[PDB]
Design a protein around this ligand. Structure first.
Ligand SMILES: [Zn+2]
Ligand SMILES: [Zn+2]
Ligand SMILES: [Zn+2]
Length: 108
């Protein structure tokens, strides 16, 4: 119904902002990619999360879990591995909360 349609729109907006944050690392040296990504990611994610609080507060604990999964995987990774650890767990956890059965990326 209306709630699931609004949740899906928010999940899509979160993913699009996440992809835009990844784009900011294109021409950044490896050791600076995670800090660059994280600064870009936090601005747009916080705006998306506040939209969820307003329009679909039932989604907020699920979004919190996706972010925690990603931030915590990056937190424990060695510096050279932090960016890919975030990206991998954020994208997989977002597909899990969205109910997408193919969670590990399938190559085209
Ligand atoms: Zn930890
Ligand atoms: Zn398959
Ligand atoms: Zn996987």
């Amino acid at each position: 119904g209306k709630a699931t349609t609004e949740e899906q729109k928010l999940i899509e907006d979160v993913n699009a902002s996440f992809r835009a944050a990844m784009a900011t690392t294109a021409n950044v040296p490896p050791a600076d990619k995670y800090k660059t990504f994280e600064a870009a990611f936090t601005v747009s994610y916080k705006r998306n999360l506040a939209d969820a609080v307003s329009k679909a507060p039932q989604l907020v604990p699920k979004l919190d879990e996706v972010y925690n999964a990603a931030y915590n995987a990056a937190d424990h990774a060695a510096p050279e591995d932090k960016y890919e650890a975030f990206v991998l767990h954020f994208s997989e956890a977002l597909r899990i909360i969205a109910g997408t059965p193919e969670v590990h990326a399938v190559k085209p």
